[PDB]
Design a binder for this molecule. Structure first.
Ligand SMILES: *[C@@H]1O[C@H](CO)[C@@H](O[C@@H]2O[C@H](CO)[C@@H](O[C@@H]3O[C@H](CO)[C@@H](O)[C@H](O)[C@@H]3O)[C@H](O)[C@H]2NC(C)=O)[C@H](O)[C@H]1NC(C)=O
Ligand SMILES: *[C@@H]1O[C@H](CO)[C@@H](O[C@@H]2O[C@H](CO)[C@@H](O[C@@H]3O[C@H](CO)[C@@H](O)[C@H](O)[C@@H]3O)[C@H](O)[C@H]2NC(C)=O)[C@H](O)[C@H]1NC(C)=O
Ligand SMILES: *[C@@H]1O[C@H](CO)[C@@H](O)[C@H](O)[C@H]1NC(C)=O
Ligand SMILES: *[C@@H]1O[C@H](CO)[C@@H](O)[C@H](O)[C@H]1NC(C)=O
Ligand SMILES: *[C@@H]1O[C@H](CO)[C@@H](O)[C@H](O)[C@H]1NC(C)=O
Ligand SMILES: *[C@@H]1O[C@H](CO)[C@@H](O)[C@H](O)[C@H]1NC(C)=O
Lengths: 37, 96, 271, 98, 344, 43, 49, 49, 50
């Protein structure tokens, strides 16, 4: 989709919360930060 | 603007079709509700005794303890959706 | 005197510099206006008007360029600062302004004056007409005059332990000169930073003059050392302005209670 | 979970709000106020000045009618589906899966 | 008529709309003003050139345009973009007659839309100037070899508006600046202004004056007075508060304006309240009632009886006996013989 | 490339071509090994 | 440039209207496909044709 | 052309409405795909035989 | 116009001056000093999301 700045990628697979696009979603979880998976 | 009324007359009929379309939309809106709800030609009444094989229908049957004969769940839905509506008043009296 | 230079520092302005942009009264609406405003969290200089070298006069009247606006403020305990002389080059050949507070009159005097190297005034009136008008000696030609009540309605006669929070914005554009002001009380005695709180700068007066201003100068009131000419402690802030886009949230009263810009951060633009 | 009912109301309110706000657009004319444009202009050019605003407002009304019809089509389709569901689930037992 | 047929079937149709016209005209203007001398701004034995730019200030005065016609030699008062008929009572703020004398041989250049060499060097005339062209028969008095009316034909380059030539800076086109010599490629403004009678039809400087204009950015300052009338309440009238046209019903309001605040608005970016220009009273502006009309008929094939439905209006506001000042003249709908029923 | 410019872009779909294939394979496996019982509860 | 802007805006509005019209057809086709999936793949259908 | 943007600015907001109209379709496409294909809760697998 | 001038692989005929594309926009230009033509590509642009 493009270049994403401000989120940290994680290898864990969770249910989609905010659809970034192309199968990648972002959510606010655990201290606390925004992650993409 | 009395002049603008004369100037707009030079553009032909740019108001009849808009009114006709809006009237058709309103008529269709009424027809939708009539089709969905008006499906029975008789108004049945539940028996005074409310025992049906042990099943409890008190949360969906209407109750006469209110001016509007609405059930508990219907009242909850109405309170949930009443954030925005038509306005519930159209008599212009409260409009300043 | 043979005073030395001082290093100007900076401090965080927080949310400051908001004035009513339009005359129309509106309530409960969230209007967005495009006009010059002080950007949120911007550097503002904080010259400290203290007793210089324990009694030596300092040159704390820098020739600061006017550019497009100023956010002159004050956290003074008493009244020490009067005078906002503007000028292209500060001489007798250039039309200049001055906002004095002699007696109970602003005395808006629009003429050409010869200005001394270090203009200053006396807070206490001279004994037996005072000789305070030593900032200028000659006036050549005059166009406009405006005398009315003083711009400063704050009084120190009640008691001490509380300082002023005078705020002013001087905006000049297309041949007009607008003045905005507001006063609020202060609780903490620390003058390092302004308290974080929204304030509305209600307009006070409009001027129809079309003078060209390219510099800003301030004046001080030093009556006597009671060597040199000196008084107590003071501090004023100078901040510039640039065009921006703002969103204002009026209340039921009709007064601006909070404002959010549209260029500070991505959340601001989202809002 | 009643977002479907709220979406229609939000869409209608937004359409009405933008239709109202479209009145303040100058459409390239000298002024957006009829009284000011009438008093501050001579008849030779006031005609075309008013005509520009008239054309803009007619375009706005035509657009609004177009999206109103488009939304009405979907509302009618949903109403037909609801009527079919009522007649097939309430008045009888349905063997159709899901 | 509206169905364009001679037969109408059973149903309900929308035909037209009803409204109430204004009944009275109310004007409220400030009662403080000063006399306005239109051509007394200049008073000297001999006039000066464009370089003077010094004049007395005219403001807060009654700009009655009949005074312009009262003077014998006044000829030009028409505005190129605005009709003088509407200008007869239009209000402006901070309007003064500039003091500058030009040859006036370029009438089309003075008006906005054209720029020339004189505009390039002497004084720029932009294509979008709000000022109008005002002139009067005073050439004989001002006009009189005689080069007292100096003009700057040559300058460094083109100048932006309001960048008038006051300090003479002659053109420099060499390594050394022009120092006291009017040598080649270096020109001085000292030349005759063509005062000779060889062009007696007209070449002498004709006083052309342009006046700055402001359009309701501030409360009205200079314009002629009008007959102030007491305000009325609860009546659809033509209100002329602060010189702004409008039509509506004026009533008492509790809109707590700030000391400087004057107007009022709502979410619909339209006026909602106004303060009295004379007394410290606050009133809210609202237009008088209107709505739509629907006709209910059983069909022309059965009977000609009809029923009329008024939408969104209470029965008291629009009865069938009101015929004083409304739309729908012949629309009497008879009287209360048939009872009126109030619906949602 | 692909017209581009003039502010005309194409946004990628949320679901890639592999997740759709996984869904179809899961549906086929359920239909083969369960019949119709996997559409009303446990397989 | 005013007239050019009006023309380009008209073209853009026409394109948007056509896209909005086609979206309804795509929606109807998707709904039919979902119904057919749920009624043929997940079970046995007695509806003719 | 920034001057073209300046002469466009007085036409109100004709761009936000178009952007919202297109974003509606863009959002609806994903829902159209999910309604059809996402009909199961678990990802079943077939035995090796 | 504004664009990223870079090397080009188009084989202009000796007389040809300008280049075009399907969308009828400028794509290449003739070098005044030399005989090697250049490509014009607008530099990066796009939209943001929060
Ligand atoms: C069918 O369902 C309804 C709704 O749950 C049952 O009515 C409910 O009965 C309970 C049991 O008494 C009530 O709880 C208590 O009621 C007393 C009455 O004074 C109240 O003071 C307590 O604070 C407590 O709420 C409950 O209120 C009541 N609900 C309603 C809406 O009346 C009903 O009993 C069920 N019938 C059968 C046959 O199961
Ligand atoms: C809008 O401004 C007013 C101040 O002008 C804010 O305070 C309100 O002031 C009025 C005037 O005194 C109060 O009315 C008074 O109420 C008391 C009872 O509390 C009554 O005994 C008095 O006779 C008088 O009527 C009013 O209560 C007070 N507060 C409110 C909410 O109106 C007002 O708060 C401002 N509006 C908002 C939304 O903040
Ligand atoms: C996450 O996956 C990447 C490959 O996609 C791998 O390089 C990385 O080491 C993994 N991080 C873990 C398992 O913590
Ligand atoms: C009409 O009458 C008054 C105002 O005329 C007011 O009660 C309300 O607007 C209406 N009332 C009824 C009962 O229709
Ligand atoms: C702004 O203030 C900070 C803190 O005093 C300082 O480090 C920085 O250099 C200042 N920037 C400018 C441009 O003055
Ligand atoms: C004229 O206007 C002034 C405005 O300050 C007002 O005080 C005065 O009462 C007015 N005159 C009359 C006769 O009302």
């Amino acid at each position: 989709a493009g270049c994403l700045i401000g989120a940290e990628y994680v290898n864990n697979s969770y249910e989609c919360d905010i659809p970034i696009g192309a199968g990648i979603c972002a959510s606010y979880q655990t201290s606390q930060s925004i992650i993409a998976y | 603007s009395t002049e603008c009324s004369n100037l707009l007359l030079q553009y032909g009929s740019f108001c009849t079709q808009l009114k006709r379309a809006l009237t058709g939309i309103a008529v269709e809106q009424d027809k939708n509700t009539q089709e969905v709800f008006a499906q029975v030609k008789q108004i049945y009444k539940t028996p005074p005794i409310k025992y049906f094989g042990g099943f409890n229908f008190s949360q969906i049957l209407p109750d006469p303890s209110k001016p509007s004969k609405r059930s508990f769940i219907e009242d909850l839905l109405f309170n949930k959706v009443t954030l925005a509506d038509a306005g519930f008043i159209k008599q212009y009296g409260d409009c300043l | 005197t043979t005073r030395t230079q001082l290093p100007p520092a900076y401090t965080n302005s927080f949310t400051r510099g908001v004035y009513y942009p339009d005359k129309v009264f509106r309530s409960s609406v969230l209007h967005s206006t495009q006009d010059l405003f002080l950007p949120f969290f911007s550097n503002v200089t904080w010259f400290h008007v203290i007793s210089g070298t324990n009694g030596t006069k300092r040159f704390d009247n820098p020739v600061l360029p006017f550019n497009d606006g100023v956010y002159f403020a004050s956290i003074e305990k008493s009244n020490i600062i009067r005078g906002w002389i503007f000028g292209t080059t500060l001489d007798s050949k250039t039309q200049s302004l001055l906002i004095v507070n002699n007696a109970t009159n602003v005395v808006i005097k629009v003429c050409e004056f010869q200005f001394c190297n270090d203009p200053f005034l006396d807070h206490k009136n001279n004994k037996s007409m005072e000789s305070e008008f030593r900032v200028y000696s000659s006036a050549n030609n005059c166009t406009f005059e405006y005398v009315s009540q003083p711009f400063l309605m704050d009084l120190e006669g009640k008691q001490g332990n509380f300082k002023n929070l005078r705020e002013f914005v001087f905006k000049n554009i297309d041949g007009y000169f607008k003045i905005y002001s507001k006063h609020t009380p202060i609780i903490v005695r620390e003058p390092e930073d302004l308290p974080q709180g929204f304030s509305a700068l209600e307009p006070l007066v409009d001027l129809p003059i079309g003078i060209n201003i390219t510099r800003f100068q301030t004046l001080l009131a030093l009556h006597r050392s009671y060597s040199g000419w000196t008084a107590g402690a003071a501090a004023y802030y100078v901040g510039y302005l640039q065009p921006r886009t703002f969103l204002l949230k009026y209340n039921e009263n009709g007064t601006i209670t909070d404002a959010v810009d549209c260029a500070l951060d991505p959340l601001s633009e989202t809002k | 979970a009643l977002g479907k009912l709220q979406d229609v109301v939000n869409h209608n309110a937004q359409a009405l709000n933008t239709l109202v706000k479209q009145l303040s657009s100058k459409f390239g004319a000298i002024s957006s106020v009829l009284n000011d444009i009438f008093s501050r202009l001579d008849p030779p050019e006031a005609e075309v000045q008013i005509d520009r605003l008239i054309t803009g407002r007619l375009q706005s009304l035509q657009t609004y009618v177009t999206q109103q019809l488009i939304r009405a089509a979907e509302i009618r389709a949903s109403a037909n589906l609801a009527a079919t569901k009522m007649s097939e689930c309430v008045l009888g037992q349905s063997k159709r899966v899901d | 008529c509206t169905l364009k047929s001679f037969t109408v079937e059973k149903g309900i149709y929308q035909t037209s709309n009803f409204r109430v016209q204004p009944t009275e005209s109310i004007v409220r203007f400030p009662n403080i003003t000063n006399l306005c001398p239109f051509d007394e701004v200049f008073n000297a034995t001999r006039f000066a050139s464009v370089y003077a730019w010094n004049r007395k200030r005219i403001s807060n005065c009654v700009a009655d345009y009949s005074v312009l016609y009262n003077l014998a030699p006044f000829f030009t008062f028409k505005c190129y973009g605005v009709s003088p008929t509407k200008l007869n009572d239009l209000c402006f703020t901070n309007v003064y007659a500039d003091s500058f004398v030009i040859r006036g041989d370029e009438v089309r250049q003075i008006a906005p839309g054209q720029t020339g060499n004189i505009a390039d060097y002497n004084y720029k005339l932009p294509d979008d100037f709000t000022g109008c062209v005002i002139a009067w028969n005073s050439n004989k008095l001002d006009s009189k070899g005689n080069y007292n009316y100096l003009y700057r034909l040559f300058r460094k380059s083109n100048l932006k508006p309001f960048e008038r030539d006051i300090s003479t800076e002659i053109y420099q086109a060499g390594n050394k600046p022009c120092n006291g010599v009017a040598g080649f490629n270096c020109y001085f403004p000292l030349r005759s202004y063509s005062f000779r009678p060889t062009y007696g039809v007209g070449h002498q400087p004709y006083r052309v004056v342009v006046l700055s204009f402001e359009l309701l950015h501030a409360p009205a300052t200079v314009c002629g007075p009008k007959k102030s009338t007491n305000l009325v309440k609860n009546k659809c009238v033509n209100f002329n508060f602060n010189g702004l046209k409008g039509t509506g019903v004026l009533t008492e309001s509790n809109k707590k304006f700030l000391p400087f605040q004057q107007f009022g608005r709502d979410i619909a970016d339209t006026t909602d309240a106004v303060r009295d220009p004379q007394t410290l009273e606050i009133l809210d502006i609202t237009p008088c009632s209107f709505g739509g009309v629907s006709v209910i008929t059983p069909g022309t094939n059965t009977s000609n009886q009809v029923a009329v439905l008024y939408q969104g209006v209470n029965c008291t506001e629009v009865p069938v006996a009101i015929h004083a000042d409304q739309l729908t003249p012949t629309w009497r709908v008879y009287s209360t013989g048939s009872n009126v029923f109030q619906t949602r | 490339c692909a017209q581009k410019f003039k502010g005309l872009t194409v946004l990628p779909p949320l679901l890639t071509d592999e997740m759709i294939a996984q869904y179809t394979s899961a549906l086929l496996a359920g239909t083969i090994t369960s019949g119709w019982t996997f559409g009303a509860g446990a397989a």
